[PDB]
């Protein structure tokens, strides 16, 4: 699972 560019916008 290399999908950390979809949750980063929120985790940022």
From Swiss-Prot:
> Where on the tree of life does the source sit, at the highest rank?
Eukaryota
Protein name per Swiss-Prot or TrEMBL: Thrombin heavy chain
Protein's gene: F2
